[model samples]
Target: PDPNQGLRAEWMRGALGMLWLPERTFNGNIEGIRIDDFLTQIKDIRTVDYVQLPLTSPNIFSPTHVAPHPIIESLWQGDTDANGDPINLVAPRESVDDPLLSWLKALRAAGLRTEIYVNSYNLLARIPEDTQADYPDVSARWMEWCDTNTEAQAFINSQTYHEGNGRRKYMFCYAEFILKEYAQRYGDLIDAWCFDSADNVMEDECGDDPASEDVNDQRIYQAFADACHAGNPNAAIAFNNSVGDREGNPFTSATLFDDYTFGHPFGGAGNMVVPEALYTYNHDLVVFMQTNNGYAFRDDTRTWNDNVVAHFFPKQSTTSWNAGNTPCLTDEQFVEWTSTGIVNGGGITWGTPLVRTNLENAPVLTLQPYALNQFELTDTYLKEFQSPGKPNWSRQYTILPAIYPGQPYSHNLVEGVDFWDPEGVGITGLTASGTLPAWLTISQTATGTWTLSGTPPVSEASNYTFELMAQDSDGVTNREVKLEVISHPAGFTNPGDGTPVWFSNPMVLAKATALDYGSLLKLGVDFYDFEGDVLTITKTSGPDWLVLTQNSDDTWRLSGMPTAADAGENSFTFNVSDILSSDTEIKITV
Candidate 1:
């Protein structure tokens, strides 16, 4: 229904999404920097349709918080360590400029659907105690807001606040607040929203005080959805309920508020044991999961209180786990886990070790490391799903008025790019890759644009047609272009008003005909130059797959096997030109 919404699924034709808080890795190393430096680190990556930025992961343990990742820019205040360590309460560096916005623009400029990976209750619940220091004023504001807003005050002040770092999670009053904050500020720039394990309240928080509302509740569900849409009218939302935890069932309205499914039907070690019923019922729902070694690696398996935090905090510096940066699955196994679901019409998101283990080591991007390995693998394997539109080249052109051998001649290949990748990865930037004649050249006059400029030599005076390629971050496409050159001679005179006439007994000077499939067709016509300077025939219009040839006899014809897939529109037009620069047109229809 929404045009922008369709842009997402259109590109999701495969495992077309990636998840990583690159700014974390950016901040993880030397102090926070701009996106240019961030991109400099990962320029080696190919292309991805969507990128998910997790503001904060599901940290259900230690109520105290830590320094903020460079992405958030210290705007919101809330944190918890999966290890429940409350001692290291270091506040993150305050904002330098707009870090989150920079990432959004940089990624979108590359034509990617940016998404917000909201950590369900983890991010919504403001541990008032946790932020009392770094965010004193904001902490007081939320505490004061709850005091005035008694609708959720029942659960806001309940003993659950201390129950494993506050059952105070999912307080709709606050969830609505932050969700709105994110949607309004960045929603237009954002494309998708996936609330990670959002409905912790429905399980009934400690003795059922009913202080908070679950994401499953229709009003709350639609409310948050509405907030997100309010900003970017076309943005889509998905509340991940860890659908994989339960077998075969849809997470009630997980597909409601209507956009996509937060699919997580996988077993440990990155194996997908999803029941056929899940797909049978929600076949069209897009599924996403942290499928790469389970983010924190399933080997370290830790689960409790409905929040799976294996990937929520820092890894044990000395933890002896993981196969030393080996990929989660072989190329063969990866296709099994991804293609099966993608072929069935569901989009999948890939979770990767795009960065280093949090706080354990220096952040690295270019090393021939695990994440970079993934960069190459996905870029290479998923190419079929990543469609970069063909380069829009000049359909046809001719050098004018018998130009002198030393005369300068030129033609511009493009004005502005037509449609490129459906991912909206428009050709804001692309590299032209192909060979051109030595005397001929191509130059980029603007972003995702180029021009053809060159001087023609007497020997180079002939018809030229070939293909050029344009490569963007995603993949490649082609441009079939043509250039016709007729050189000037010893001042030829115009015998008949300078305009050439068709001497060949042509039918109406142009005509149409049809041939059955698998038919071999050849056609040609003669148009003489009155001044006897010699004439040239150039195919001015036709499909890229069509072929036009000239013989040593100074004659030309169109010959093709009509059974090719593109042979249906088997019609072509030729510009019959005399060296004196007179023209006559002829068309043949199959």
Candidate 2:
């Protein structure tokens, strides 16, 4: 049931992308920052197509205003005090700001796809010193009123810490509500949701009780999943339960709702092992990695992510995460990494950072030129990876083995392998894309292979060339095919006119005796050929007694003494042949 049809084939293909988010979240409230400059600079990055907002709260956007949503209101109304009076159990957060809403909009409008990260665990523990600080107040209210009403009791929370069965139920639903809120508001903008740290709950929720965990996974995150799909049915959701330590990392998650595994990976060094799919899904995962001391995108020339980029995919993998401090990769390495990733069948999110600084004496994001340069390199490689190269010939320019004037000739032309198509969904086709020589025709034989078969015109010279093109769905490759046509051997009487050009025979004439002259008389005979090639002469018609012997220097001697019976006016006719052509004939009279 792939509705996208031909388009879905490329869903897991190589993608070049990076995380685009703030360098430091404790920089406070994300104010005094110029977002346009950051967006403007980062949008133009090379090879980077997918973007993840950030990890942890410093970058997550949780809507602080919770009064109007129907679910919350219905749940609030569903439970009341013993006196039947409505109890206000929910508390709104003190601070709620989401720059990513605009970020998502800009990225989507600019033709870039994006995944917004959301972590719903440990909201009660977050205070003012941490990100989404005000969430602490809202989280604590469940515990504060846990004993006061059914809603509070069902959403278990102890005064001291988060605990009990109802507590998890509350966490799940609350996260659901928050997620639903996002889907409703940013549905069209966001492409994916990385519900962070899913491994914690799937293992801890039911104490490994198979039945309870299964039910709990459904009771909790399964319900949370509904919220995700409710907002935008198209966005992919990944639950982070494991890390891709190396290339063979399996793509599986906690539940059936998983679209792609949340690829939290480390260094993918050494052999870029293609990941083995252990369960069902797209076998596609975004192996999001933070690097160079916690940044997902590194400006450092270091090669850690370079190896990770190599390690990605089923064979090809994609990555997106935080920014880096030290210079990590070279521009060439960046292009190579991206190219390698695409060719193998995967995608990458550069996690390119928006440098945080007080350049304006306030918290502001500036572009990292070094990292940006690495991106610029991808832009070109994208074209390189998508396009085709020159066609191949068995021989470029030389005497064609079986090709001769007026003879049937055939030759094959082939195009070499093409660069990776990260965006490819089907087999790219090839054709004899350009015009052919009138004397030589072209036809397709197989994918990337064509036949140029026809007769060479007798009038064509020994040297001939034709420029032909081999094209694929999007690009063209052309080359020159030179041919040296073999012409027929001709006489000098009128070069190539088939007339036998005579050569003087050096003869020693002597009066013939009726009996054999103890030694036979010899007369040297030869013929001039315009091409001066070695030729074989066969006696077509002649006196059997007049034997002709061929010499090493291409000369023939007529031997055997002429008896009285072998009188005058005897004649011999011979046929001459060369490797390429045959001469008319030669006649000599004695």
Candidate 3:
């Protein structure tokens, strides 16, 4: 309904809003409705938590394409004669007409939050001399206006210029300036900051090493966030990280921002999941929920909510009134989509004329009693589900004869553990419960498979028993799994004649019949952490040319040819740590 009518502390908790981009004069719409009028219409159409303001265009002249504020126009026109002679362009000034700011002010007065978008780079030749020549009267006024402001010239001279392009290279400094401008000028009207870096910035700037490139991107994004924080510390920052599903090629490091909009080419209807490994990272994920072609409804709405905080963005064509289709969802579909977002603790973002058409036609779209019920029910269910499992040690110890005293012992408690759904529906709501043994640990290190690992004390070799419990989303608990750890006499195996194993090509280091080693060598060279909580055995080395794969049986297979750096003698370290214990490093040289 009046999305902004009754603002609550939880307004943004699961909010709905429109992504507004006004008609730009440069883009052909030289005359249009006043920004305030558009905002007024927006207010009556539907309430939104915040509107997305894309104002961050790099340069003296803003790139938003909205009518240039007179101050901005003067800065761009420069104070010079028609013959290009220098003139006193720092004497007088005109207050620019900034429609974006006006609209933001109006929206705030209406009690709505705003997600403002800013660009990091500027296009130098946006308005060539020829284009400016066509508006002589407007251009002359702007030049005379900039002639009086001494502050303008000082601002221009202070900025750095890039050698590659004569255009200024104040990307970092300019962003800070704009952010501070908003903070001081607009105060607390803006709620979220979306900083966009062009694709080339991600590809060309990041050097050869992907790992190092990741750090570079992190540093850049951190700078952007720092600038945002410098102006308004309260504003939430979002960055476009991985464009589309190209997973590993991340543009933003996601560490510095509050949320990430990983754009999907599939639009609103595609099914996607945030990789489990990413659960360890923080960020609210926004996806395309409604595209021009159709709406994206989750096949398994229940589990999708549990996986990630889905921010559904319903985008429509703003270029033309008849461009593509308008609000393809039926009234029934629209209501269901809105309620589903609320029920799953997600957000909804509508775009353009779609917002205008939907609320105008179907007044039922205004009220969300269904959403209230869905929120209540889902939250209740969420609170009732407790994580499952508890631990108890058995009173039996099976001793093993002593072998070599110097060798540390390692063991695999279990390859992996699977948490089952009691009702056999899905593992959507299951979680590990209770404190595991100090020597044992579990993790979903590989794909969806969860692995358990542990290392026992070298002095006391004995048999041990442990129990695990699994809990489901609906308060269902399954706790009958029992695990056993067999302690063997500790010993080490000499893979070579006390020298580093040499390999020019792919190699597998496994036990041979004639291998002379310690007693535990027969069991396997699988090293475990103190608590046996090790999950995967991975290599940490100088050159990444050498690849290591851990077998399901706990043994390791080495492949990939070493680089020239790996010549003479190359050393690499392998580590395994349980979810509960410290990592154990096992070094190998080649």
Candidate 4:
């Protein structure tokens, strides 16, 4: 069923407006009049999704004068025509061939959903009493006269009268007749029937007693809804009622209607915010509004922001649709607010071709479906890659007599990776895939926590790199990352082997250096000791005066004073070893 399908109809952001037919066509050559050109123009804009044709709005010509159907100068004129005789008019053609019906059918053929505007208060106000005076002949042909009530007949017979000033009993019957006809002819082509009235029926018909008048008015509105359903069961209905407490409050009529129209801070009559109690009146209700700079609760500079604010209805099982006056602003600002409204669940609508032309000329704007998450990383260095007991240490010891240092290597993939939206906005799915380096596997240990496992490749140990792909719910045409896998061999180097020390005035000293192969090679003084792997020192050979000692800073120091007895020089040697038994020695001379 139509179910008053919310603003996001057919999954598209839409708009509501008078959308009347213009008098002149920009192309000038089409099968029909200016309205046909206007229809083509709107279709070309490419932004508009839903359209509400003004079957009865102040924006269009006389509501009673269905153009190209009959040339009735005035439906309310009671005086005689050019001849001195009683005047009565009948529809020029069959109701099926009405111009409005033809236009609606054409709109559907062009892929646009049409809404029929039903004026609840003034359907039969202009059917002159003299026509009814002629009775049988005129009344039989003119269904509107037959639909008129006693009070309506009396009011029309008077010298002067206004809409809803008398009884509105005929409104129910007349509206039903029109709706039944359209439903039978168009079926589901008519998407929705928007019901509105220029004045309050309760105040005009039940001014003496509002309580009783309200009940009767409710009956009339219900009958109108029933007639519409009888024609098209799936068609939706929208009621336009002013803001604040009144007998004609549309919010109270939700049982018979699907939706209601009002402004942001409530309807046009009251500037106060719509109360929560009214929302409880109907859980499936939808709140629709038009932005008004006059007496606006908000500012004009950021009117589009108001559209964003009106979209809270979805949270309460409702929806919000918004519109703007086309010529009110420059082309840029017009497209800006209109487009903004659509992204935030606000539909874009324009009144006439003049406004649409301005929008068409404006520079196109691209919309972002999702925003990136916020995160900041200070430093990426965790620890030296290949040093013993570090993260990248080889898993097993070397098998040969001169074995290289071996340790298992595992890296945390998500250690410094965090780009998740807090409320899950724009994030569809989180996944990881790649060709991991030899002897390495990657898996997600937890949310955003990834672990890589396997023994480090010992084939002439060096740094190995690979690429992995990560994606989110939003389609991934641009989001991918590259990571490097680094591993180093276990080896030691001596830097003081070739150095010769000559006797100084009293003493001579030499410094020894040893190295471990990795991104940052470790010196004899810089070796770190861990729980599983340890570095130790042993004096293999040394003279009495030439001594090797490990300082508090972990560096080995070689120093000695030479005497006459120790003629030319003395030599000292020391070796360093790790828990895995990989050892290296360096000799120094003094």
User: What's the count of clashing pairs in each model shown?
Assistant: 4, 33, 28, 8
C-alpha lDDT of all candidate models, in order: 0.42, 0.44, 0.37, 0.35
For 1-590, candidate 1 gives per-residue lDDT tens digits of 13342233333444345555432222222123233443444544444456665544343411111224322333333443343222222223433223456567666544456667665543333344454332234333444555565654564445333223233434454455555665687766877777655555423332222112342334445555678788876676666545433332223322234355565433322323234543333332222222321111123222211111111111111111111244544555444445444432345566544434343355432222554555556544444343324322211111123323444655443333222443444554433344456676667776655666677675665555666665555566665545555432333333544455454322222222232111111112245444334556666765554456552223343443434455333444556555444333433444
Task: Please identify which of the two predictions, 3 or 4, would achieve the higher TM-score against the true structure.
Answer: 3
> Mind giving the per-residue lDDT tens digits that candidate 2 earns over 1-590?
11321122134345555665543332123322224555567544433456666423422233222213443323233334454322332312112224455456556534456766666453333233554332324345443443456654554442222233434545644554455775777675666667665555534652222123244334455555567677777666556654543343333322444454455434333212223332112122322221221112233343222212221322121222333343344567556655654544445445464444332244446446766776666765664453334222211121224355655677554433221233343224333333444677667777655566887776766455556544444454554545565443342243465333444322223334333321111112246544444466666775666565553233444445565566665555555555443333333333
Candidate 3, position 191, lDDT: 66
Q: State the local distance difference test value for candidate 4.
A: 0.35
Best by TM-score, which number? 1
Give one digit per residue, the lDDT tens place, for model 4 in 290-370.
232111113334222222212111110012121222132233433333333333333322322222221114311111111
- Which RMSD does model 4 reach against the true structure? 35.4
Weakest 10 consecutive residues of candidate 1 by summed lDDT: 308-317
Considering summed lDDT, which 10 consecutive residues are worst modelled in model 4?
370-379
Error of 2 at 347 (Å): 2.5
Could you tell me how far off, in angstroms, the CA of residue 401 lies in candidate 3 after the best superposition? 85
Which is the better candidate, 1 or 3, if ranked by TM-score?
A: 1
In terms of TM-score, how similar is model 1 to the real structure?
Answer: 0.47
Off by over 4 Å in 1: 1-15, 22-47, 61-95, 122-141, 148-170, 206-216, 244-255, 268-324, 359-361, 365-368, 384-590
Pick by TM-score: 1 or 4, better one: 1
**Number of the top lDDT candidate:** 2
